[PDB]
């Protein structure tokens, strides 16, 4: 029996027979960037497969599009008819009908399906945490129920459990039929973080200190004659998993290439290193005129706009008060009214910021504006590789305005990196952020 084969790559870039071998490389995207994906898959000479299906999952900071699913066969669409397609956020299913496995089942050559598709990296990517995609290809002679597992998060503490349930290929309940050995993986990244097996009398099994804010799946190493149904997910901290005894081959799982978005984080000081609060701040391409970074708006949602406007009032509130006080009256209680507003308005202009162009007026409302919270934090996150500009619109309360811009590079690691000469958070032990000086005297 020859094998079907599969491979999922970029646009272009997918080869079942020589994947590209550095796919744990993440390419580096920008929220809102579209980002096109091809998963080509060979099916042999003669096959005669009851169930052909593919199914395609991706971490939270991807959206798949709607819409965007095309699938050929020889370079020939297939029909609506002959292929069943099911969307949901963080993905899709694709399922040929008897009408489409008839134009792959008992053909005298190889025949290559390949489906395209685009997912937009979103709000929620996390500056240089990778953002990935995981598909799998379940088919055999006897109708197949597998399909691909879905990430999730650890709970509140955590904790991630996993829950085997076994049925027969009508579906019914049986008794565990194998021992059940799964690999969990940061979904993110691609990392293997355990392995844990089921023994056929105790079909629960929960995975402790993961972190709360990654996402994983426990991937199920092929039982043979079971094929493995990931069930959607409902909750953080649980994963179910239901074994059909299909009696069909293990299904084809290929590697993943994966995207990331790259940051800053800056702090806001006077001569004497003392943190300054409200300073506000826009982004430039180039240190004289040039263009300031805004987010589209034809991208920003009504309800993100007006968060924005809301936040950017009660900050503006929250530090006119924290500057009518008196240096020893700026106690932490204070600098706290600050950083949680400053904080809220943060989240809200990550949020809005959906996608990104460069305008010519900084005098527009989709301009993004930093602002410095009282331990004089600000921070850009979503960004391409490159090299940009501050430029300081305001200045902190009894400080002259700057009459420069100031540069910095955006890389792989300028968000988190340590050695760029200030702590972002004071005592942290980690000095990852660059200190815009301020002055009296410009």
């Known amino acids: 029996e020859a094998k079907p084969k599969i491979d999922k790559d970029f646009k272009g870039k997918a080869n079942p027979d020589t994947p590209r071998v550095d796919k744990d490389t993440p390419v580096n995207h920008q929220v809102g960037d579209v980002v096109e994906y091809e998963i080509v898959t060979k099916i042999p000479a003669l096959a005669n497969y009851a169930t052909a299906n593919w199914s395609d999952r991706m971490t939270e900071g991807l959206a798949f599009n709607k819409g965007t699913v095309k699938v050929t066969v020889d370079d020939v669409a297939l029909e609506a008819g002959d292929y069943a397609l099911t969307e949901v956020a963080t993905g899709f299913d694709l399922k040929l009908t008897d009408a ?25 990517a996390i500056v240089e945490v990778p953002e990935s995609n995981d598909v799998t290809f379940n088919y055999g002679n006897n109708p197949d129920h597998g399909n691909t597992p879905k ?26 039929g194998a021992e059940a050995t799964f690999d969990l993986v940061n979904a993110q990244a691609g990392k293997v973080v355990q392995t844990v097996t089921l023994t056929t009398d105790k079909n629960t099994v929960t995975v402790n200190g993961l972190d709360k804010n990654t996402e994983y799946k426990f991937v199920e190493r092929s039982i043979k004659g079971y094929s493995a149904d990931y ?3 409902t909750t953080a901290g649980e994963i179910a998993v239901k ?3 299909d009696e069909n081959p293990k299904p084809l799982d290929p590697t993943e290439p994966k995207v990331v978005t790259y940051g800053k984080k800056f702090v ?14 826009v982004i430039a391409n180039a240190d004289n005129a040039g263009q300031y970074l805004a987010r589209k708006a034809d991208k920003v949602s009504q309800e993100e706009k007006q968060l924005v406007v809301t936040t950017k009032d009660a ?5 006119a008060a924290y500057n009518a006080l008196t240096a020893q009256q700026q106690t932490q209680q204070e600098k706290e009214k600050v950083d949680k507003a400053q904080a809220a308005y943060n989240a809200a202009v990550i949020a809005a910021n959906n996608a990104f162009e460069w305008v010519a007026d900084k005098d527009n409302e989709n301009v993004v504006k930093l602002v410095s919270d009282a331990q004089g934090r600000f921070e850009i996150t979503g960004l391409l590789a490159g090299t940009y500009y501050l430029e300081e619109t305001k200045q902190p309360a009894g400080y002259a305005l700057l009459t420069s811009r100031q540069k910095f590079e955006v890389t792989a690691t300028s968000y ?19 200190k815009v000086v301020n002055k009296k005297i410009t």
């Open 100 to 124: 489409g496995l008839a134009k792959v089942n008992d053909q005298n050559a190889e025949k290559t399906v390949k489906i395209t598709y685009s997912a937009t990296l979103n709000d929620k």
């Open 151 to 176: 990430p999730n998060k650890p709970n509140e503490n955590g904790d991630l459990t996993l829950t085997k349930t076994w049925v027969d290929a009508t579906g019914a309940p049986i008794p565990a």
């Open 231 to 233: 069930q959607e997910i």
């Open 243 to 245: 074994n059909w005894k």
């Open 268 to 281: 806001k000081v006077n001569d004497k290193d003392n943190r300054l609060a409200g300073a506000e701040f």
């Open 315 to 319: 900050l503006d509130r929250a530090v």
């Open 416 to 434: 988190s990196a340590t050695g760029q000469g200030i702590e972002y958070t004071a005592g942290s032990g980690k000095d990852d952020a660059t």
